Paper text:
Based on our crystal structures, we proposed that APX879 would interact less favorably with the human FKBP12 (hFKBP12) His88 residue than with the corresponding A. fumigatus FKBP12 (AfFKBP12) Phe88 residue, thus potentially reducing immunosuppression. Similar to the hFKBP12-FK506 structure, in the hFKBP12-APX879 crystal structure a C21-C22 dihedral angle of 36° is measured, positioning the acetohydrazine in the same orientation as the FK506-C22 ketone. Interestingly, peak doubling at the highest APX879/FKBP12 ratios (1:1 and 2:1) was observed for residues in the hFKBP12 40’s loop (40 to 45 and Lys48), 80’s loop (Thr86, Ile91, Ile92, and His95), and residues Glu62-Gly63, suggesting conformational dynamics on the NMR timescale for the bound protein not seen in the FK506-bound protein. Z-score analysis revealed that atoms of the cyclohexylidene (O12, C33, and C42) and pipecolate (C3 to C4) rings are significantly implicated for hFKBP12 binding, as observed for FK506, but interestingly, several regions of APX879 become more significantly involved in binding to hFKBP12 (C15 to C18, C36, C37, and O8). APX879 makes a greater number of structurally clustered interactions with hFKBP12. Overall, these observations indicate that the fungal FKBP12 proteins rely generally on the same amino acids (most notably Tyr83 and Phe88) to interact with FK506/APX879 while hFKBP12 relies significantly on the 40’s loop and Ile91.
FKBP12 proteins are members of the FKBP PPIase (peptidyl-prolyl isomerase) superfamily and catalyze the cis-trans isomerization of proline imidic peptide bonds. The immunosuppressants first bind to their respective immunophilins, FKBP12 (12-kDa FK506 binding protein) and CypA (cyclophilin A), which subsequently bind to calcineurin in a groove between the CnA and CnB subunits. The immunophilin-immunosuppressant complexes inhibit calcineurin serine-threonine phosphatase activity, blocking the dephosphorylation of downstream targets, such as the human nuclear transcription factor NFAT (nuclear factor of activated T cells), involved in T-cell activation and interleukin-2 transcription, and the fungal transcription factor Crz1 (NFAT homolog), implicated in virulence, stress response, and thermotolerance. To this end, we characterized high-resolution structures of the Mucor circinelloides FKBP12 bound to FK506 and of the Aspergillus fumigatus, M. circinelloides, and human FKBP12 proteins bound to the FK506 analog APX879, which exhibits enhanced selectivity for fungal pathogens.
Residue numbers in the entry: 1 to 107
The structure:
């Protein structure tokens, strides 16, 4: 449902743990490589917690594997993203997504 391909390594030691908030930057693209969203465009890190349905499942399972400082490409099947529906005006139906995600820090 999610493949993780590292772009730049993290420290390999500091992973998200229960009660912590992940602070990330991301860019989301479709399979054709075209961007549909990026926190870097608005220069606003995205904060979320694991275990609360705060993100699509591909992020839930992918970012949980990342360590602080890591930049990774997450390739997410529709089951782990927006499935047959998509997201109105942004993501088409049945869309495999590619996110470039950087774990900036844990809070
Ligand atoms: C009150 C709600 C506002 C609230 C919005 C924010 C905290 C802002 C946050 C940065 C999201 C971005 O705002 C510019 C947008 O980012 C994307 O462009 C993106 O790149 C993108 O894919 N993501 C953003 C970065 C993480 C991975 C992923 C993600 O998981 O996004 C959450 C989301 C829409 C989950 C669905 C939720 C329902 C559930 O059933 C579905 O299961 C199939 C999944 C999103 C964090 C959600 O949990 C919280 C919200 N939702 N608003 C909604 C749904 O309208 C997606 C396509 C759309 C997002 O705007 C809604």
């Amino acid at each position: 449902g999610v493949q993780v391909e590292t772009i730049s390594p993290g420290d390999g030691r500091t992973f998200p743990k229960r009660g912590q908030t992940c602070v990330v930057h991301y860019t989301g693209m479709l399979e054709d490589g075209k961007k549909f969203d990026s926190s870097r465009d608005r220069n606003k890190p995205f904060k979320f917690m694991l275990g609360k349905q705060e993100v699509i499942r591909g992020w839930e399972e992918g970012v949980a594997q990342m360590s602080v400082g890591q930049r990774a490409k997450l390739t997410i099947s529709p089951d782990y993203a927006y499935g047959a529906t998509g997201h109105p005006g942004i993501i088409p139906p049945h869309a495999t997504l590619v996110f470039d995600v950087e774990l900036l820090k844990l809070e």
